[PDB]
Motif scaffolding. Structure first.
Motif, PDB file in Angstrom:
ATOM      1  N   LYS A  42       0.821  -1.075   0.085  1.00 40.05           N
ATOM      2  CA  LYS A  42      -0.209  -0.038   0.072  1.00 40.05           C
ATOM      3  C   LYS A  42       0.974   1.415   0.076  1.00 40.05           C
ATOM      4  O   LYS A  42       2.161   1.137   0.328  1.00 40.05           O
ATOM      5  CB  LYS A  42      -0.909   0.095   1.077  1.00 40.05           C
ATOM      6  N   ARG A  43       0.188   2.351  -0.430  1.00 40.00           N
ATOM      7  CA  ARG A  43       0.988   3.561  -0.732  1.00 40.00           C
ATOM      8  C   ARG A  43       1.597   4.175   0.791  1.00 40.00           C
ATOM      9  O   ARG A  43       2.836   4.710   0.513  1.00 40.00           O
ATOM     10  CB  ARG A  43       0.144   4.566  -1.367  1.00 40.00           C
ATOM     11  N   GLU A  44       0.917   4.128   1.666  1.00 37.09           N
ATOM     12  CA  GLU A  44       1.219   4.831   2.832  1.00 37.09           C
ATOM     13  C   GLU A  44       2.467   3.924   3.656  1.00 37.09           C
ATOM     14  O   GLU A  44       3.151   4.445   4.454  1.00 37.09           O
ATOM     15  CB  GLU A  44       0.169   5.128   3.836  1.00 37.09           C
ATOM     16  N   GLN A  45       2.544   2.521   3.472  1.00 35.56           N
ATOM     17  CA  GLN A  45       3.342   1.620   3.908  1.00 35.56           C
ATOM     18  C   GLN A  45       4.628   1.810   3.092  1.00 35.56           C
ATOM     19  O   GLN A  45       5.674   0.968   3.576  1.00 35.56           O
ATOM     20  CB  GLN A  45       2.791   0.301   4.100  1.00 35.56           C
ATOM     21  N   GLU A  48       8.355   2.926   4.720  1.00 30.64           N
ATOM     22  CA  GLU A  48       8.753   2.125   5.858  1.00 30.64           C
ATOM     23  C   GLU A  48       9.000   0.717   5.566  1.00 30.64           C
ATOM     24  O   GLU A  48      10.002  -0.126   6.030  1.00 30.64           O
ATOM     25  CB  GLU A  48       7.632   2.156   6.941  1.00 30.64           C
ATOM     26  N   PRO A 114       4.871   8.891  -2.509  1.00 34.73           N
ATOM     27  CA  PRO A 114       5.851   9.440  -1.768  1.00 34.73           C
ATOM     28  C   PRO A 114       7.327   9.128  -2.665  1.00 34.73           C
ATOM     29  O   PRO A 114       7.481   8.104  -3.118  1.00 34.73           O
ATOM     30  CB  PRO A 114       5.888   8.700  -0.430  1.00 34.73           C
TER      31      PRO A 114
END
Ligand code: SF4
Lengths: 571, 162, 191
Positions: A42-45, A48, A114
């Protein structure tokens, strides 16, 4: 188990590490024929996940590739997230000798990813290329602009709705561009280029030809953005247009010095898609022609680097290539079956004449290159980087083994029966100097001569085309006097070979580095996505990281020592 | 050139070719001969001292931005310079129009063309040096050697002063 | 044979006869001028992708009165090609190497101009992916013939200020007999 089988790679320990870190959910493992584990993050992970991969006990240290894909027209998407677009990151771990793929899904309304340059600094040009060819924007990216097309370009070329045709040529637009070129130095704004704004003088410095902007403290050079895209041929967008068989010349024309070496990865990835296991004779012929063109490219590079501080060798190799194949420069000879024709009835004599005369030429070359104290003094200590500026800026050519990193594709991930040929690859020690790179390519040339001698010794006498029904084209005599072979030749020439919807990837040690093809098929006769990862792209991206604190002469000596090709860079 | 003038005693070329009536000036002054040849090559901007911008990329040749008859004039001017340097070299170190049997103008033309073929040969043989040894040689090895040559030729012409 | 006159890509050309058939000193002097332009031809090999390296195995602009466009006609480099064309001085001639300079040449795609014919006039074309150096040399002979049969203004003060290009017979019509009269060829199963 065949090597082309659709594997899911859940037995890879990196998948288990990801499941232990981020849970069994939150990422989707895709079963492809690429040979690598592909995970949809996923994009927000994403940041990290990349940070976790960078801090493994044997971390994934090199960003091999980073590019987008238009998922809007992809019909066969089973086990995949709902994506209008996707961005795939191909990461290589050398200590594990493995590689992983990270796919991020995107919708039409929010094409924002990101940035990845805070983790891998070679992602700058890849994200610029993704913003140019697709509509994907990267958040937190310096000087995010078009890198292949000029800034006065409206649409996005690699999008599916963009027509892949040359429009009508208006002279009015060409006069606008000529007037812009006339006032380029007058209206120069060093904020769009990503520059620092009294000594600093800005100039455009016009193998190929490309502009490189330069910031001068007197003569010493402080910043540089090499302007590329001047040799953009749209190889990938034509890959979405041509069939599986008609794209072979376009694979020849990305790197003209390599040629047959550059149509090797497309052919191998296409055979992975079709499930074709070529016989050993085809493998030996491929190895011989690839090392022949590698000898051509290495000889031309050594001759070019030694001229500023050769004819008969390249002419004899070109005569042998003209005998085996069609014309000398672009053979267009590798087929999906493996070759176009069989070897003629005189290649033993030509190859033995070539191999009984080149070792003394190598002795002369080494005697020249070991005794030129002027060239050794000019080439020592210039553009020095050991394994760290080469592990993060791509740099998969002779420089990677000049750092001491023991990673060759022909040994780490063997292809086309290269395990059957005995050759010891050369590796440099410590600093990846220019002279060490040239000596490494000299030793690679000697190893290529050894490989050619082994190919001449033991050539199997099997078929030159596989027995698979998807070998395009089928053998010609059976086409001419059998009707089923005529059917297969007709439908593989007219519409194209129908290949099932899978995802394939071939990684190849090219003449100048690691060239890779990544083919996504939608079940049709064309290629839904063709991605060509090139070594010279990452080799040109690392000039700002190496020639900050040098002169113009040092910069152009380093440029000559890089074996880059502009058409190879710009596809 | 003051080496030859000091050996002869006057600037006039007829006095040079009449003072060379017994021995040619190449054998007593060989250092003067090689220094004059190198200086004549470099002043004329011939092949070893050609394209000094080759070691740099912020510098281009002055021959550019000319077109047609101006660049042609530069070319033929360089070549009349090299042939008059050949003529000066033969008339100042070899025998000016001096020969046993052939006519004097025929001898002068033959020796001038002999120097022209020597210039073609040294062009074909010696590779281009870079700029730093060009400056270092042309000062450090060239000027003290011709000063010492002038001192030694002064000493030997004053020793046999009768 | 008859000529086309260009007088002061979008301009108009008309097909007329040569002005030399209408003086005897002007005829031989124009012949000497055309001979001098034909024999001494100075090329400017433009550095492009993959035909330029092929004719390497075969100077500065404005002294070379001839441009050999080698590679693919990129939309970014097309202004460079035209600017370098207007740098050179009249008379000037253009030789196109490869299919990429004659036409689009296997790249009919968005970023490729379909040949330099779109924006600059071309005197001699050479077809095909990379032509041999002998093909370049035979194109040089063909262009030498074309230059040798021309009628250009000898001065910009006195005379007709128009350039007369000759209508050469096409090479496929001239070499038609020797090409059609080919019976047999060597089999491709040997060397
Ligand atoms: S014709 Fe072929 S070799 Fe020439 S520029 Fe085009 S692709 Fe390159």
């Amino acid at each position: 188990e065949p090597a082309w089988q659709t594997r899911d790679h859940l037995d890879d320990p990196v998948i288990g590490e990801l499941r232990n870190r981020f849970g069994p959910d939150a990422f989707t493992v895709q079963a492809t024929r690429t040979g690598v584990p592909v995970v949809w993050i996923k994009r927000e992970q994403l940041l990290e996940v990349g940070d976790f991969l960078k801090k493994l006990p044997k971390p994934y240290v090199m960003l091999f590739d980073l590019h987008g894909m238009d998922e809007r027209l992809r019909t066969h998407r089973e086990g995949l997230p709902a994506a209008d677009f996707s961005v795939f990151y191909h990461l290589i771990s050398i200590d594990r000798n493995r590689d992983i793929m990270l796919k991020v899904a995107l919708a039409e309304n929010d094409l924002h990813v990101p940035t990845f340059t805070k983790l891998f600094p070679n992602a700058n040009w890849y994200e610029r290329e993704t913003w140019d060819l697709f509509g994907i924007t990267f958040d937190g990216h310096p000087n995010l602009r078009r890198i292949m097309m000029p800034q006065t370009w409206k649409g996005h070329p690699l999008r599916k709705d963009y027509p892949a045709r040359a429009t009508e040529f208006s002279p009015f637009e060409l006069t606008k561009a000529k007037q812009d070129l006339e006032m380029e130095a007058l209206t120069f704004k060093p904020e769009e280029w990503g520059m620092k704004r009294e000594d600093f003088m800005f100039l455009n410095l016009g193998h190929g030809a490309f502009r490189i902007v330069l910031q001068l403290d007197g003569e010493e050079i402080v910043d540089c953005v090499p302007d590329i895209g001047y040799h953009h041929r749209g190889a990938e967008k034509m890959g979405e247009r041509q069939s599986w068989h008609s794209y072979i010349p376009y694979t020849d024309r990305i790197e003209y010095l390599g040629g047959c070496v550059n149509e090797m990865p497309y052919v191998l990835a296409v055979e992975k898609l079709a499930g074709i296991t070529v016989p050993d004779r085809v493998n030996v012929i491929r190895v011989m022609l690839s090392e022949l063109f590698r000898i051509n490219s290495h000889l031309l590079y050594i001759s070019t680097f030694i001229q500023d501080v050769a004819f008969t060798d390249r002419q004899k190799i070109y005569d042998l290539v003209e005998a085996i194949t069609g014309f000398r420069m672009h053979p267009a000879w590798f087929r999906i079956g493996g070759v176009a024709h069989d070897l003629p009835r005189g290649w033993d004599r030509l190859l033995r004449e070539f191999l009984d005369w080149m070792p003394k030429r190598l002795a002369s070359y080494e005697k020249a290159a070991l005794q030129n104290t002027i060239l050794k003094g000019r080439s020592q200590g210039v553009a020095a980087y050991g394994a760290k500026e080469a592990l993060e800026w791509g740099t998969t050519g002779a420089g990677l083994r000049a750092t001491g990193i023991d990673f060759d594709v022909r040994k780490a991930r063997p292809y086309s029966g290269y395990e059957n040929f005995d050759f010891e690859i050369p590796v440099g020690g410590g600093v990846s100097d220019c002279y060490t790179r040239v000596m490494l390519k000299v030793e690679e040339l000697r190893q290529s001569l050894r490989i050619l001698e082994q190919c001449l010794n033991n050539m199997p006498e099997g078929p030159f085309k596989a027995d698979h029904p998807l070998t395009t084209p089928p053998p010609k005599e059976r086409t001419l006097q059998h009707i089923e072979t005529l059917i297969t030749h007709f439908l593989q020439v007219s519409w194209g070979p129908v290949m099932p919807a899978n995802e394939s990837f071939q990684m190849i040690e090219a003449t100048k580095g690691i060239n890779s093809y990544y083919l996504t098929s939608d079940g049709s006769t064309m290629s839904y996505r063709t991605r060509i990862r090139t070594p010279s792209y990452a080799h040109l991206q690392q000039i700002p990281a190496a020639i900050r604190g040098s002169l113009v002469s040092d910069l152009i000596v380093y440029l000559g020592s890089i074996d880059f090709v502009m058409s190879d860079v710009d596809r | 050139l003051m080496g030859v003038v000091a050996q002869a005693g006057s600037f006039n070329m007829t006095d040079i070719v009449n003072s060379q009536a017994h021995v040619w000036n190449v054998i007593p002054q060989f250092f003067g001969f090689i220094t004059f040849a190198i200086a004549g090559v470099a002043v004329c901007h011939r092949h070893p001292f050609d394209q000094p911008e080759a070691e740099q990329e912020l510098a281009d040749g002055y021959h550019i931005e000319y077109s047609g008859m101006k660049f042609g004039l530069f070319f033929v001017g360089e070549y009349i310079g090299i042939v008059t340097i050949s003529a000066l070299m033969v008339t100042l170190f070899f025998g000016g129009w001096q020969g046993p049997l052939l006519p004097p103008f025929i001898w002068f033309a033959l020796k001038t063309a002999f120097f022209m073929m020597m210039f073609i040969l040294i062009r074909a043989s010696l590779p281009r040096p870079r700029y730093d040894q060009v400056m270092s040689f042309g000062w450090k090895i060239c000027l003290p050697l011709t000063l010492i040559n002038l001192l030694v030729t002064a000493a030997v012409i004053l020793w046999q002063a009768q | 044979m008859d000529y086309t006159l260009t007088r002061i890509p979008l301009q108009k050309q008309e097909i007329v006869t040569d002005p030399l058939e209408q003086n005897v000193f002007m005829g031989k002097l124009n012949d000497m001028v055309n001979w001098g332009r034909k024999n001494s031809i100075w090329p400017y090999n433009f550095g492009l992708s993959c035909c330029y390296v092929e004719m390497v195995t075969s100077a500065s602009p404005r002294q070379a009165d001839l441009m050999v466009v080698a590679g693919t006609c990129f939309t970014k480099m097309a202004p460079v090609i035209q600017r370098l064309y207007d740098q050179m001085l009249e008379p000037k001639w253009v030789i196109s190497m490869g299919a990429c300079a004659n036409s689009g040449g296997m790249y009919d795609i968005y970023s490729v101009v379909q040949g330099v014919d779109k924006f600059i006039p071309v005197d001699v074309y050479i077809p095909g992916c990379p032509p041999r150096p002998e093909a370049y040399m035979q194109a040089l002979m063909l262009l030498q013939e074309s230059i040798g049969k021309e009628r250009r203004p000898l001065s910009w003060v006195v005379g007709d200020q128009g350039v007369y290009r000759a209508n050469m017979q096409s090479e496929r019509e001239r070499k038609r007999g020797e090409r059609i009269a080919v019976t047999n060829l060597r089999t491709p199963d040997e060397i």
